[PDB]
Amino acid sequence: SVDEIVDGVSKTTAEVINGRKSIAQYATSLIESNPEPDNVRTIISQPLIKNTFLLVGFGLEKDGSNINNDPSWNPGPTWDPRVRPWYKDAKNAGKLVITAPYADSASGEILVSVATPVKDSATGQFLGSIFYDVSLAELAELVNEVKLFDAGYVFIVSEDGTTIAHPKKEFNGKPMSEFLGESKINVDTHQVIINGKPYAVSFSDVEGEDWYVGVVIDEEIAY
């Protein structure tokens, strides 16, 4: 039953996503414990962090300076972290948040960031925000790793149908109607005609985020 397949895929998706959240929150707590620049570098420049996220950086409220874990990239004349969506989202939320999809400053690629505020341990005053960049391509690939029927794919949307992750990276950050036709989420399994063929499409909410995972399966193989 498709509902059972997509319900199982949402469980996995949550684990994938919650794993990234847990690591991001761990690094952020250790940083809050002692936000000395050298301790921040040590915390974010370990293999675990460099292998989980595309890039990690701490932007400072005081002066728009930043500490990050890729020496190859230093921000140009231009770049002020304080103007970036991950910065503001974490500051506004005052706790760990994941951004909507947006275009990365350097590459233009569509991504999301796990973002956390950093508060002064003593005062409680906002010092800045940390971003943990997440690859949507890798995300799509992960939630598509174990598939049961080998005739379709898994995707992730926000509640308004904005694509978070699709196997084809060209859909990331775009409305899901670009590959489903329909623009609003119909959670219940239903038939969608694509290219003249019938597919069963079904969604399941992702615990902890305002995302759904969706499934698109060729019916003649699906059943």
Quick check: helix, strand or coil at residue 205? Answer: strand
Query: Between residues 52 and 202, which has the closer beta carbon with respect to ligand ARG?
Result: 52
Beta bridge partners of 157: 163, 212
Reported as half-sphere exposure (CB side, CA atoms, 13 A), residue 64 has a value of 10
Q: Does 121 bind a second copy (CB under 8 A)?
A: no
* Among 36-44, 75-83, 107-115, 183-191, the segment contacting a second copy (CB under 8 A): 36-44
Beta bridge partners of 162: 175
Crossing angle for the helix pair 2-33 and 136-143, nearest 10 degrees? Answer: 140
Q: How far is the CB of 169 from ligand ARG (least distance, A)?
A: 15
Q: Tokens representing 126?
A: 């906002």
Contact, 114 vs 135, CB < 8 A? no
| Residue 166 contacts which entry, ligand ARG, a second copy, none (Cβ below 5-8 A, type-dependent) | none
Q: How many residues would you count in the chain?
A: 223
Q: Does 49 bind a second copy (CB under 8 A)?
A: yes
Q: Does 112 bind a second copy (CB under 8 A)?
A: no
The mark string for 141-160 relative to a second copy (x by CB under 8 A, - otherwise) is ----xx-x------------
Query: Between residues 63 and 207, which has the closer beta carbon with respect to a second copy?
Result: 207
Query: Between residues 39 and 189, which has the closer beta carbon with respect to a second copy?
Result: 39
Q: Does 12 bind a second copy (CB under 8 A)?
A: yes
Q: How far is the CB of 217 from ligand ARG (least distance, A)?
A: 34
Query: Between residues 35 and 101, which has the closer beta carbon with respect to a second copy?
Result: 35
Interacting residue with a second copy among 4, 33, 94, 188 (CB under 8 A): 33
Phi-psi region of 220 (alpha: psi -120 to 50; beta: other; left: phi over 0): alpha
Interacting residue with a second copy among 4, 7, 13, 19 (CB under 8 A): 19
b/e per residue 35-66 (b: at least 16 CB within 10 A): beeeebeebbeeeebeebbbbbbbbbbeeeeb
Maximal CA-CA distance, the chain: 63
Contact positions vs a second copy (CB under 8 A): 8, 12, 19, 22-23, 25-26, 29-30, 33-34, 39, 42-43, 46-49, 51, 145-146, 148
